[PDB]
Every structure is written in C-alpha cells, then in structure tokens.
Amino acid sequence: RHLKSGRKLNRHSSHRLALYRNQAKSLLTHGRITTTVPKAKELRGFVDHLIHLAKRGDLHARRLVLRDLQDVKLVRKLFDEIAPRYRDRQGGYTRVLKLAERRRGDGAPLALVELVE
Amino acid sequence: MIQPQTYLEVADNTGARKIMCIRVLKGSNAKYATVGDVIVASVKEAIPRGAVKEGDVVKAVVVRTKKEVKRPDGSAIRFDDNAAVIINNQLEPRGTRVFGPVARELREKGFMKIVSLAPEVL
Amino acid sequence: MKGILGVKVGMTRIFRDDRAVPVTVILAGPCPVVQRRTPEKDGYTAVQLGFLPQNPKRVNRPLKGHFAKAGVEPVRILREIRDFNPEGDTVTVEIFKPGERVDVTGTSKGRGFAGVMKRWNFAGGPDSHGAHKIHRHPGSIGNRKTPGRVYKGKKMAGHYGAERVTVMNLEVVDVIPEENLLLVKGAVPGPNGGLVIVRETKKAAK
C-alpha cells in the first residue's frame, strides 16, 4: 500500500487548497510571511506556481490564477506589480526560511518565507 | 470471467441457453469456470419441447468478459457468457448453435465440430 | 557464473512469434576489488564493485582498500564464493550469454506494517453478523494449559517490507553488449532503478 508518495500534505484537500491560497494571497500582500515549517515548504511550492503565471503575463494566465485567488487588487497587484520584478529568473521565487522559535503551548517550529528578492 | 455457481449461457440444443454449473471440471479445486474449460451443470432456464430437459451435463467454456488473454498476445472480451453443452465424451450437444470463431476455442481443440460449426457473424 | 547489477526497470518485449515480457538489467562492469585467495579466505572467491558515486566524497580507507590491486573510483561493491576471476575486470558484454538460464536476486521493496491482513495470506476475519472488528483482524494465539500460554513463531503483524531476497530460475533472453544491459523477463525481484545481482545454478534434471 503506502510509501512511495508524492505531493505530501495535511488536513483535508479542501481545507488545504483553502489555505495554500489564503496564504499565497497574504504573502503576495507582504512579500514575506510567518507560519509553520511545512506551511512554508508547500506554500512555497504553491504561491510558487502562482507567481509562475503572474509571470505568464497575459489575459489568459491572468484569468487563471485569478480563477484561484479571486480579487483584482492583488490580481493585477501581482501580475504587474512584481510579476515583472521576477519574469526572468528560473522560478524558485520562493525563499522558505526557519525562524528562531516555536509557537507556544506546543513549540511548533516556525519561520518566515517570502518572494525571494 | 469465472464462477462456481452459475447462471451461464449456451445455445446448443439447450433447454434454454442457460444452466447453472456447480464448478470446474479440472484439477480438484475448481473455483473457475474459465475460458475454454470444461465443467458441470443443470438447467436453470426453460425449454420448449426439445429432448434437452431440466437435467445436468458438463461441457465446454465459451466467452467470459474479463480478459481472454492469448498466447500470441491476441486479446479480446465479449459482453457475453456461454459455452456449449456436452454429451459424455464431450461430443457436443445440438446440431448447430448461435455464436462464432477465435483461437481459445479451437485451441483447446477437443471439439473441432464446435469449431467449424459456429462460424459467421454472431 | 555471476553478474553484478543496477537493476533498471521492467518492460514488455517480443520473442519468436509472440510477445511476452522482460526486465532491464544494467551493469557497467565490476572488477577484482578484492580476492579471497583461499589461502587468503579458504572460502575462496571474488568481491567487486560496478560503478562510481562521486570522488570528492571518499574515505581514505576506501581509497587505499582500492589502492590494493588498484581499480577505479566507485562505491557499489559485494562478494561471491566459488567463482574464478578469469580476468581482472568484468563487463558482461559477453559475460552473460543469452538463450541461457539464470537465477537471480535483489533488495526487496519495503512493505509496511499490516497484520493477519498483510504479512500473511488469508485476508483477515469476516464481516457482518459481527462488526466489533468489521471484515478483518488477528487470528488466535495458543491456549489454556496446552502449552499453557502464548505460542512462539506463527506469522505476525507489521514491518515486512524492509528486507531482501531472490528468485530461482529465470531466462537470460537478450544481451545488449553496448549499453551493458540485458533483458530477462524477471520477477523484478525488489525495486528497480536500484540494486540487484544474478548468479547461475541449476543441475536441474527437468
């Protein structure tokens, strides 16, 4: 049965996509954001592909990721605001990085991850 | 593909192109009225007249639906389940019957008659 | 009669007048990395390696163990007895002739930890007239004053994947002397794109 496994995640696909997005969005907002270990890791993979279309740069692409984040402010905000800033590298526009501590009650190890300038 | 208890189809001198087999005639440990095999059964379905009756013969395996995988990587499946009824020796039951060609059968061989007999479309 | 290999992947092919399926064996060519002379290891034999994973990475020891009769710059190595080295370097570019029968083995893909369910046969218990365990669960384990307790060696739940093993006879099918590869129609014993070996024994009188 289980072992050889790809795209590894938690909670529930709907919950997840939910987050991936919400977050992708908030980061887009702040360039850099704070959450937990893989929150970042995978969020990287994702907000990741998004910036990918951000770059894509075109009526269509736009149409798509918008499909996913829903809201102009950012829509354009990214697509033109920074999408250029990046359009030229080889992806990996994500910088996921391990902070100094762990949230309370538990010691959940966290970090900041952002668009890698 | 197979079955023990079975509502199978035929089309020889059938009472009805249908009988229920108990099991496989092979190596004492049935579990598969399989393609091109020979097994046991009684009638399930009716029979206008016909010397057939509501008895039980044994016979040979036609069609199946769940992989007719051949030696030459010849491949097929008919959305049909049926074989031909036998009289002792194997020697088939009826004068004719409604169905046709394809390796597996003849290949099992012992039944050439079935062989030339069910040829054309259907 | 032995080949050392990096097991590739399984795939289908054709032979005579019919298709059938094979597997991809690949082996650069191990070499006399170490010899047990008999007076050396009266369990006389040949140990070899067959590739090379980065040099900047390599313990001194390795470096000189090699030094020995000196050969190359790899890490894949192991041994087998009663097998002369009518060479001091081997490939299979002939080493292993096709239309021959072989025996072979390899690492065994790593399962999981499933009980009466996995591990052993018979899929668990039953399901319906009873569901305070729905479908399957652990068989029985001994008894009152028979041995007066719990048994000692019947199959058991869990870890049953991280191991190794082999397959008896199989066919040598075909030899590709260039890209040191061979198609053999095999039980892909253990993964693929990983490690395996072949040996040939069978005074089998049909």
Add this chain to the structure above:
Amino acid sequence: MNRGALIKLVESRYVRTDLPEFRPGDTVRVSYKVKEGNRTRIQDFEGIVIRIRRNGFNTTFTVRKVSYGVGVERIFPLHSPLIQKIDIVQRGRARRAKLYFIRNLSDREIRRKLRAD
C-alpha cells in the same frame, strides 16, 4: 539517463515503429488483419472490423476493444506494435467527445443510439 533512456532504447530496438500506422482516431469503427494463426501455420490476415474503443500508450500500447456486433456483442482488444499485425486500415470517423472507454457503445448501444453518437 536511466529508465527513460536505456529502455526507450531497447524497445526502439525491437518494436521500432509499431509499423508507422499512426491512425488512432477516437471513434472510427475500422478494420484489420492480424497474423493471428494456428493449425498448420495458418497465420491468417484475419480482419475484424470494430468500433474504436481504447488504448495503452508507451513501447507496448494497444488499439483497444473496438466493439463489434457479431450477432452477440464481441469486443476486440489488440496490442499495437505487437508484430502480430499486418493490415490496419480505418473506415469510420474519428469523432465524438468524452474520450474513450465510451463503452456507452457495447453497453446500452442500440443501433439507433449508436448512430446517435
């Protein structure tokens, strides 16, 4: 390298093109002759017509059950390269949507419906 590589290779070796015949088309009932034979090497250019159903794709591939109303429903599935083949000529139309395994056919077909497509 690896898999992709080497293997790609061996197969290319044996199958070569399955005999350049690249006429797939979704629909199209069509007809061919496989060597399929036995009894005194009666390898017969046997031709079956069949309404195109599905397929496997990579080295080993197969022009799937194309169902054929013989007088009962018989569906024919056949490996692609499979040297087994000689003639393979289309007749029917490569039409209809939803893609293959559209057994809709073999199943509730009904000649009429059939044509309905």
Add this chain to the structure above:
Amino acid sequence: HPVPKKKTSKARRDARRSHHALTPPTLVPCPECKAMKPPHTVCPECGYYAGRKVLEV
C-alpha cells in the same frame, strides 16, 4: 480490566523512566553575532546570513 499485579519496584519504574532519559539542545554560534544558533536559523540580534531583515525595533 487488566490492572497489572504490583510494580517490580521503583526498580522497574526506573528501568523504564530510565531508558527514557532527557537529552540536550543542538547549537553553534551566530554566523553573524555570537550566541547559540541551531543549524539553519537567525534570531533577535544578528538574524541572517544575507540580510538580517530581523531584530531591533
């Protein structure tokens, strides 16, 4: 339902609590300032390797 029988002494209790045991926390010095830094991390001072982007306010 299955409440043991007694307690093989503190003895046992230990046997266990014991193999248990509490190890210590990994650390070297700030690639930047000083103090303890666990492998990949920054902190309320140095906070970097290429852009503190952190500490002081």
Add this chain to the structure above:
RNA sequence: CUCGAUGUCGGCUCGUCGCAUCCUGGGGCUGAAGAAGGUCCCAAGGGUUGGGCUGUUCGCCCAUUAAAGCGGCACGCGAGCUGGGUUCAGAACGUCGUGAGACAGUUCGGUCUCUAUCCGCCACGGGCGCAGGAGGCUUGAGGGGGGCUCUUCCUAGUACGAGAGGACCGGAAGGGACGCACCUCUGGUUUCCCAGCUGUCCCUCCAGGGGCAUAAGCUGGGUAGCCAUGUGCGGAAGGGAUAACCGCUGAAAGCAUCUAAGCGGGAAGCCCGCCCCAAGAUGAGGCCUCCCACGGCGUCAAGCCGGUAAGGACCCGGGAAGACCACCCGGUGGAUGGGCCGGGGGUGUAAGCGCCGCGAGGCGUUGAGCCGACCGGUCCCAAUCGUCCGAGGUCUUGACC
C-alpha cells in the same frame, strides 16, 4: 484443587502435535497373468475441495476428487470475534397439577465489558561488550522457509493373454491447489488529474470562474504508487547414512542360514544440496584498507586533555527504507529536494475573437487547453556558517626485529 468464582454448546479465525496413514510411497502375499483389487510391517512428507438441510460437530444428499483420515490440547481458542444454542422473568399451546406452578415437550423475542503490569510472541531500536582506534567485504557451526498431485500424452494395449483382459523400467505435456517476488501486459484504484451537470449565495450583469450542495455534491474516463482477477518463478536434481522388505561371503546347528563376523540392495523419510536469518555462536570474528602506536598526567599512566575528519556523530536536506528509531544518498568544489524546462501519460479541443441559426448552439483558430507522484536537463530557491566525540585498539603464550 475450584462455589471471594474455572464461560459449558455450534461456528468462526490462527491452529499445534499424534499415528492404530486416507492420498501419498516401500514393500513381502494372494485364491497375484495384465490391469485392477484386496492381505499385513515400514514411513507423517505435503497434501487431506464446493454446496444442500439441519444452531446440531455426526449425519444423509448433490458434484467432483489422488484423496476427500481418527484424534490429542478443559471436547484449543471471550482478555480474539460470533453468540442460533440449551439455561433468569415474558407469552404460546401441547401436558401434570384441585391450582398456585410445573415439563431435559416445544416454540417467538431474550442488555457478552475489556485503557496490557509480568513471563510469552511480532517487530524495531537504545547499551555495552566479543582489551589498538578505525571504513568495508565475507564464512558460516546453528537456526528458519518450501518439500503435493492430478489427468492426458510419450514406450501402450508386444508384459498376462486361448479368448473377454491389462505394462513394470521408464518417458513426456499441461493443469489445480499453494509459497516467493513483481507491473511491462491485463484489469482495480487515483479526495483534485482532466473532462460534463442541476441547485445555489458570491465576484463585478454577460459570459469566466467561486465556496455548498457528507471528511471530493453528481457523473465519465484517468496514470504514477500500491494492487488481483494480470506476469516471472518454485516445489529438482542430485550426494551419503537407512525403515519394512531383498541379497553376498560364513560358521556355532563336520548338509542348511542374510547372520554376531565382514559386504552390498533399498524407501516422496533423516544430514547435505535449495533459498532466509546468524558470533551478544563473549568460542571466531577471517580478509581488505587506514590513523597514529595520539597527547598529558604519581609505575602499574586499563584515568585526564588535544590528539586523527583515521572516522564518524550532530543539524540540514532528500528517500518505494520508514509509527519514533535505526537503514539509505546527499549538503552547494552539489543536482538533494522544491522550481523551472524539455519530455512521456493523462484528459478531450480551452479562454477569445472569428465565421451559419430568430434561438437553442454549430463550425474555425484547437486533437487545443490543463495538468500530482513517471525519464531526465538546468544552482531559479533552500542544502551557509558551525559542533562534538571519537587510537595509543583484552588476558596469555610462543616467534622474530
């Protein structure tokens, strides 16, 4: 022993030993021609089917089968199920009772709990050690796994044979059951891969989308991984001791006898050969390479500190390996992940504008569009910086320098 407590049936699931062995073979015997039976001694090796009805195991019956054994273990199994059962009250009658009530007559229902401590089994690790300190390859004493068998065909109807009837030698061929791996192929899955759809509140009306319509609303298909019903393979040879049973040479029984003497024949069984563990077999470690005999301390320095990156651990990052853990490859003098990209294989021609129809939508640019684990490119991003522990490697004897 047990009434401060031992759950009784039937069945289930996992079974374990046993031989008066059922099928297996080895056999002497026949009223044994052949074939086939039947008559005992040897030998448990594997094997020792489905249903029917019956709460019944037994049983009788259907169909096969090589065959479809008897039984040991509280008639194994409730800390592992099941609970028709017989055995708490009901109510039923049939039956006794003057009736209260009753019948091991019966029939309808009838609240089976379980967070493992111990020794025990299944796994996986942390020690500390098999008197240098080390990286890696082995050999196994000894232990574990599997050893079946059909039917046909081969020599088959020359053995026997008046005739009716049937081959040891032996040789095939496939199959069933079953065990071990494994996806190419075959088919099964695929909670997001793609595609179609109603209802609905949202975006901004229009399309173009968006959450809810159960942890994916519906539907139709769908890799890769894992997985049968798909694929390879296996149960051998063959070597040596023998069971019953067959013989050689030979007396004591100055003729004879396999029989203490000495020799041979012989079983699918016993040791090996077959794979899988394995010196924590303190009775190994055997071999390879390599740092130095490491450096300071009260001689007995078998303690300290650096010693060696000799090496490895730590943290990081990756893994069909994986509960943790240990195993495994890697850390930028890299490709390790994710990213990106080329490509496979998926979906089934997008979004828009364009062309025919009042319209519904139809056709074009479109087999486009969009994509997760599959081959592999390229430091785009993140594997920075560091830290610590780790010889001067048991006792003993003999030998050389």
